Design a protein around this ligand. Structure first.
Ligand code: HEM
Length: 154
């Protein structure tokens, strides 16, 4: 649904994330819990983490960060053809955890902020717009599987 060139911009900056998936996951997840702390309620196990340094020292949060980015990277590498990868993820997020689409929008803002905080030279306005379009595709399709399972997304 994006252009070939737009996916090349998405996958180019994603290459920068693969050089440090753990660090990126920590910054994204911490950025998510600082900007929208209601999302932290979806993590009973991160309740005892009061400070940003505690969060950065939680191996469990680092591991949860790598699991999500690993799945996001597998989805973006399909360049839109992600039905087989996006449906199990939707199920995990609906039936198990009830993650509203609004919360996938929050982490997307966190991703954008972090990617542009670390790699502005490889994340100008064309790259941002490309990535924003990849993430919107991912959210808009997760929400269709959500409905398909009977979960509206709120
Ligand atoms: C880019 C967006 C996201 C991706 C790619 C993603 C991906 C994943 C993946 C792959 C898993 C593990 C799947 C499994 O074993 O079944 C997972 C689990 C989970 N995700 Fe997400 N996720 C995203 C956003 C969110 C957000 C915003 C929240 C909550 C605020 C969330 C909460 C969870 C939770 C609670 C689990 C279960 C893990 C645990 O209890 O610690 N995810 N996610």
């Amino acid at each position: 649904v994006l252009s070939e060139g737009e996916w090349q911009l998405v996958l180019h900056v994603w290459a920068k994330v693969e050089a440090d998936v753990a660090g990126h996951g920590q910054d994204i997840l911490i950025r998510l819990f600082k900007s929208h702390p209601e999302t932290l309620e979806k993590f009973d196990r991160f309740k005892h983490l009061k400070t940003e340094a505690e969060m950065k020292a939680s191996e469990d949060l680092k591991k949860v960060g790598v699991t999500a980015l690993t799945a996001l990277g597998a989805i973006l590498k399909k360049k839109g053809h992600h039905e087989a990868e996006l449906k199990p993820l939707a199920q995990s997020h609906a039936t198990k955890h009830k993650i509203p689409i609004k919360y996938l929008e929050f982490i997307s803002e966190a991703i954008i902020h972090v990617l542009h905080s670390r790699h502005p030279g490889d994340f100008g306005a064309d790259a941002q717009g490309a990535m924003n379009k990849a993430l919107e595709l991912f959210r808009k399709d997760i929400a269709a599987k959500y409905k398909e399972l009977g979960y509206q997304g709120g």
